[model samples]
Target: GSNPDPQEVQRALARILCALGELDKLVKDQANAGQQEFKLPKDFTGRSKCRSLGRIK
Candidate 1:
């Protein structure tokens, strides 16, 4: 049927969260380095950009 294995789903979720956390740290460091003008990939949500702008101002 259409149901997915719970274990697989949880594993995928964990991986996604881990990657996001790493990306967040990288972004924070970049912002701290005074590189806020750099553009983010289109895949990222606008919230990341807004947060960076808020930190700058």
Candidate 2:
């Protein structure tokens, strides 16, 4: 077994964040169009819970 490379780990995390951002944007667009309002708990949707992952180099 070998240890995971930090660069690869960071790349994977960045991809995850990008996907999440896309999902959030899509949900926001749907909400704005009045399709459906998702009543997610504040703890789940709160922006304050997000940390700055910083830019991927």
Candidate 3:
């Protein structure tokens, strides 16, 4: 690296790795949660979909 402060570089690398670790945990948790993946056509929308997603009043 061209004149980067070593401490700052280490901090930046740690931040990036921590963020990637969090994202990996999120993906793994989602997979383990057994959530269903909804498959719908782009145009498929109505009150029913809202209810399924719990967007109802």
Candidate 4:
């Protein structure tokens, strides 16, 4: 398909994945350094979910 919107979303997901990988590495490195608190980022995607993914069900 030649759809642009879905491609944009996929790109965003890829960027997020890369960022998460970096975060994971940092967390592991710090965990061995000292006692600290580390929390993974939360997902706010389905926060405003409706019956369907559209404006209406």
Q: Highest lDDT among the candidates is held by which one?
A: 2
Model 2 over residues 1-57: C-alpha lDDT tens digits?
Answer: 433343433333333344566545544444344333333322333343334355644
Prediction 3 global C-alpha lDDT: 0.34
- lDDT tens string, model 3, 1-57? 223343433333333333544434433433344223322221222223112323336
| Candidate 2 lDDT | 0.40
- Residue 53 CA error for candidate 2 (Å)? 0.6
Q: Please give, for residues 1-57, the per-residue lDDT of candidate 1 as tens digits.
A: 233343433333333334555445444544454333444332334333223332345
Please state the error at residue 23 of candidate 3 in Å: 1.0
Model 4 / residue 48 / CA error / Å: 14
lDDT scores of the candidates, listed in order: 0.39, 0.40, 0.34, 0.35
Worst 10 residues of 1 by lDDT: 46-55
Best by TM-score: 1
Model 4: colliding residue pairs: none
**TM-score of every candidate:** 0.30, 0.27, 0.26, 0.26
Decreasing TM-score order of the candidates:
1, 2, 4, 3
lDDT of 4 at 21: 45
